[PDB]
Amino acid sequence: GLYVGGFVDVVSCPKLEQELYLDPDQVTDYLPVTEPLPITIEHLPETEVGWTLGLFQVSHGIFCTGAITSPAFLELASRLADTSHVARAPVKNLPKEPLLEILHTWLPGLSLSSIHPRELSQTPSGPVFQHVSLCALGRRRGTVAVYGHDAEWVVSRFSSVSKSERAHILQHVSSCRLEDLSTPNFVSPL
Numbered sequence: 048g049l050y051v052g053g054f055v056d057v058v059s060c061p062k063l064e065q066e067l068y069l070d071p072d073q074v075t076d077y078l079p080v081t082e083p084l085p086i087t088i089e090h091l092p093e094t095e096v097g098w099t100l101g102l103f104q105v106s107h108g109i110f111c112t113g114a115i116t117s118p119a120f121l122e123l124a125s126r127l128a129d130t131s132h133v134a135r136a137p138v139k140n141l142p143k144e145p146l147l148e149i150l151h152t153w154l155p156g157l158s159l160s161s162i163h164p165r166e167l168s169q170t171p172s173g174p175v176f177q178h179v180s181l182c183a184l185g186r187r188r189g190t191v192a193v194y195g196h197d198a199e200w201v202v203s204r205f206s207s208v209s210k211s212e213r214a215h216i217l218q219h220v221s222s223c224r225l226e227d228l229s230t231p232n233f234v235s236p237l
């Protein structure tokens with residue numbers, strides 16, 4: 048399967064017209080989160096492609112690791128990786144891993160959806176986070192999402208994440224059997 052990793056922007060009301068970008072320090076008291084959250088595209092509920100495997104506060108931000116598990120999405124993305132000139136137009140020519148490159152380029156942003164900070168003052172009643180989205184627009188923080196077949200390879204691409212932080216992150220990513228997760232709701236047009 049495919050793993051995704053990166054630092055998140057923390058966003059409340061991601062779809063709404065008033066976009067709030069939270070400071071990490073407002074939500075770190077509610078991390079880590081090791082239970083799976085949906086991974087969608089641009090905060091659209093019907094575009095679930097995978098599940099988060101961990102959200103962790105690290106020295107230099109909030110790091111998310113996840114798996115892309117939708118077979119319909121994986122088949123579509125692989126076919127585009129090998130056959131779509133459009134998908135490959137903004138990628139360097141003739142990459143060895145076109146699928147990884149196309150996802151890295153077209154979906155570079157990871158946004159973590161949170162409740163309003165009004166609710167983070169004192170003590171929230173229900174879950175603080177709702178999902179993570181793969182995003183093309185709205186990126187504030189630096190660094191970009193990395194996609195790979197090997198979770199350890201993905202996390203090790205981030206120099207700002209230490210070997211100690213990487214090991215803590217990977218403890219939870221490997222313990223899960225991706226086959227055990229429910230099938231995301233993404234449907235391919237084809």
Ligand SMILES: O=C(Nc1ccc(-c2nnn[nH]2)cc1OC1CCOCC1)c1cccc(CC2CCCCC2)n1
Pocket residue numbers: 123124127131133134135149150153236237
């Ligand atoms: O070729 C593309 N799409 C496409 C184009 C022809 C068809 C098609 N073939 N025959 N009939 N329709 C089916 C398509 O599927 C789309 C269905 C909905 O999710 C996106 C993909 C394309 C090109 C550049 C960038 C993107 C964006 C993706 C988002 C995730 C994966 C990496 C890039 N997509």
Ligand SMILES: O=C(Nc1ccc(-c2nnn[nH]2)cc1OC1CCOCC1)c1cccc(CC2CCCCC2)n1
Pocket residue numbers: 133236237
């Ligand atoms: O969801 C997407 N595409 C998509 C979604 C359902 C279908 C569909 N519905 N029924 N059959 N196919 C077919 C789709 O792709 C076609 C429609 C759009 O452009 C070409 C192909 C999507 C999202 C973000 C970025 C892009 C890549 C752009 C798209 C615009 C042209 C330049 C590149 N595509």
